[PDB]
Structure formats: C-alpha cells, structure tokens
C-alpha cells in the first residue's frame, strides 16, 4: 500500500466549476478487493502536477479523462456533488460531510443510490449497501458508477492456504480458535 484512497481536497475548482484529470494507472492494492486508479490533475496554483489515488469504478481505463467538480458531466468516473445528480444515480466513495474525501460505498461491487433531494435545506437522501437510509449534505461528492471488482466473494476460497494468503496481507486474525475449544481460563465459552 502506497497512498490512501481519497478524493481531492474540496477546493475552488471543484466547488464552482470542474477540473480534468487523466487516469494513468489502474493498480492492485493489497488487502483491498477493489482496484485503485492513479489520476493526475493540474494544480491551479503552481506548475507542478498533483497525483491522486481513487477507488476505480468499473469501466475506467488508462488514458481516460475524468472530471471532478460541480459542473462535471454525469459520466462513469466523474466526481460530482450529490446536488448535481438526478435521483436514481448510483455513486461510490460518497462523502458523509463535504470534504471528508469519501466514506461510503467503497468496497468492490458496492455503490450508494441517490434516493431523493430536499433542495430547501440542501439535503440528500441516500441508500447505503446495507439497505440503511441516510441524509447527507447535498455538497458531498461521489464518483459516478459502481466500484470495480464485483463478484469477488462468489468464488469459494476452497483452501486454507488461500484463506491464509487473504488474511496475511489484511492483518485479520487467522486461524480462528473457537471459544468452546478453550480452557475456562481463556474464554467464557471455555470448557
């Protein structure tokens, strides 16, 4: 793992217009089921370019121009505030608050559905992958589309070694000893 998967920080260009970036690499991230996309943007304030790391939606490719901002088009890979999208649009890496660089719908094959808009108080009702309903500020950004790599859990692991390889790069506890297989000093289920 090199860099965290975040949006750009919310700046003037994304607040008032759009900025174009180019997808240079689509890379594998260890411990994550979803591929990442490296996108290069211009810095509006200096000559040097800025490289960002997004969670890649399905259909994104190297050499593609994506657009991030209020006036960006409704196209897969583009990053828009939720106030700029119609109802029924599915998005990924949705910010809980504007500027948190994305929190919801991040794992492979998952997305967040924009259910409704309340423009009077500037709120947006969304549906999460767990089925929960949520209200977020309408200026929260999301990337149009579905996170790539879906159907990963359909394949059986079939082998203790494949489970071991999955969890060794993830730090999760493996193998797992049952509590009832333990002595009473170790677990409340012990004995």
Partner RNA sequence: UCGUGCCCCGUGUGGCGAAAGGGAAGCCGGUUAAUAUUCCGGCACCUGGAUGUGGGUUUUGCGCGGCAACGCAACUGAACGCGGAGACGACGGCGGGGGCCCCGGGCAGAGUUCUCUUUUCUUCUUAACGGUCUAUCACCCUGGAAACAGUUUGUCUGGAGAU
Partner RNA sequence: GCGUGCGGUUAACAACCAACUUAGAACUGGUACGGACAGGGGGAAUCUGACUGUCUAAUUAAAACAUAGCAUUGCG
Query: Using CB under 7 A as the criterion, what x/- string covers residues 40-79 for binding RNA?
Result: -----xxxxx------------------------------
C-alpha 84, offset from chain centre? 19
Distance between CA atoms of residues 75 and 10, nearest Å: 20
Whose Cβ is closer to RNA: residue 171's or residue 176's?
176
Residues in the chain: 191
Figure out which of the listed residues 15, 97, 152, 189 binds other proteins, where binding follows CB under 8 A.
152
Asked if 129 touches RNA (CB under 7 A), the answer is: yes
For the bound state, the minimum distance from the C-beta of residue 70 to RNA, rounded and expressed in Å, comes to: 24
Figure out which of the listed residues 4, 156, 175, 188 binds other proteins, where binding follows CB under 8 A.
156
Whose Cβ is closer to RNA: residue 72's or residue 79's?
79
* Residue 154, burial from CB neighbour count under 10 angstroms (0-12, 13-18, 19+): exposed
Mark residue 70 as left, alpha or beta (left: phi above 0; alpha: psi -120 to 50; beta: remaining): alpha
């Amino acid at each position: 793992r090199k860099a965290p998967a975040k949006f750009r920080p919310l700046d003037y260009a994304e607040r008032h217009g759009y900025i174009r970036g180019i997808v240079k690499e689509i890379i594998h991230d260890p411990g994550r089921g979803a591929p990442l996309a490296r996108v290069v943007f211009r810095s509006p304030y200096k000559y040097k370019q800025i490289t960002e790391t997004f969670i890649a939606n399905e259909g994104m490719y190297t050499g593609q121009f994506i657009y991030a901002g209020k006036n960006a088009a409704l196209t897969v890979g583009n990053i828009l505030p939720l106030s700029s999208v119609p109802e029924g649009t599915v998005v990924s890496n949705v910010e809980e608050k504007p500027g948190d660089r994305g929190a919801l719908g991040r794992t492979s094959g998952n997305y967040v559905t924009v259910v409704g808009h309340n423009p009077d108080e500037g709120k947006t009702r969304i549906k999460l992958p767990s089925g929960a309903k949520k209200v977020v500020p309408s200026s929260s950004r999301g990337m149009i589309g579905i996170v790539a790599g879906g159907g990963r859990t359909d394949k059986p692991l079939l082998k203790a070694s494949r489970a071991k390889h999955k969890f060794a790069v993830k730090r999760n506890r493996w193998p797992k000893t049952r509590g009832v297989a333990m002595n009473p000093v170790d677990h409340p289920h012990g004995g």
